[PDB]
Amino acid sequence: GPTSLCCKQCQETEITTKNEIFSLSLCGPMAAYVNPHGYVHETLTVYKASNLNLIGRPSTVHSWFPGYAWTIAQCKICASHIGWKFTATKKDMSPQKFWGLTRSALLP
Ligand SMILES: [Zn+2]
């Protein structure tokens, strides 16, 4: 469909849709300055994704989104590294989980 964001490598596999896109705030209380950490402008954040295999267990090592652990996520079909599943380290956070997907790994 027109909303469909698919793996660039295998083409047919849908990973997420435009409907699931949201904007995660990268600042803390009062929206202070933060030192940029990783490469967020290159990464699309969605609530929900599909047809990915998670590799390994969540890690908090040098997370691009502090407060979240990351788990590598690759396409089930072709095993291309599409991005990561992010999981909250604290129960009071929202969302408790999301996906950070590398924009260039997706079509469109
Ligand atoms: Zn693929």
UniProtKB/Swiss-Prot annotation:
PTM entry text: Ubiquitinated, ubiquitination is mediated by its own DCX protein ligase complex.
Signal peptide interval: none
Binding site for (S)-thalidomide: H62, W64, W70
Subcellular location: Cytoplasm; Nucleus; Membrane
Location of the CULT domain: 3-108
Phenotypic consequence of gene deletion: No obvious phenotype, however mice display increased BK channel activity and a subsequent decrease in synaptic transmission and presynaptic release probability in excitatory synapses. Mice also display cognitive behavioral defects such as abnormal passive avoidance, hyperanxious behavior and decreased preference for new objects. Treatment with the BK blocker paxilline rescues all synaptic and behavioral abnormalities except for hyperanxiety. Brain and synaptic morphology is normal and long-term synaptic plasticity is not affected.
Binding site for Zn(2+): C7, C10, C75, C78
Tissue expr: Highly expressed in brain.
Family to which the UniProt record says this protein belongs: Belongs to the CRBN family.
Subunit structure of this chain's protein: Component of a DCX (DDB1-CUL4-X-box) protein ligase complex, at least composed of CRBN, CUL4A, DDB1 and RBX1. Interacts directly with DDB1. Interacts with KCNT1. Interacts with ILF2. Interacts with TRAF6 and ECSIT.
Job description of the protein: Substrate recognition component of a DCX (DDB1-CUL4-X-box) E3 protein ligase complex that mediates the ubiquitination and subsequent proteasomal degradation of target proteins, such as MEIS2, ILF2 or GLUL. Normal degradation of key regulatory proteins is required for normal limb outgrowth and expression of the fibroblast growth factor FGF8. Maintains presynaptic glutamate release and consequently, cognitive functions such as memory and learning, by negatively regulating large-conductance calcium-activated potassium (BK) channels in excitatory neurons.
Domain commentary: The CULT domain binds thalidomide and related drugs. Thalidomide binding leads to a change in substrate specificity of the human DCX (DDB1-CUL4-X-box) E3 protein ligase complex, while no such change is observed in rodents.
Record-given protein name: Protein cereblon
Organism of provenance: Mus musculus
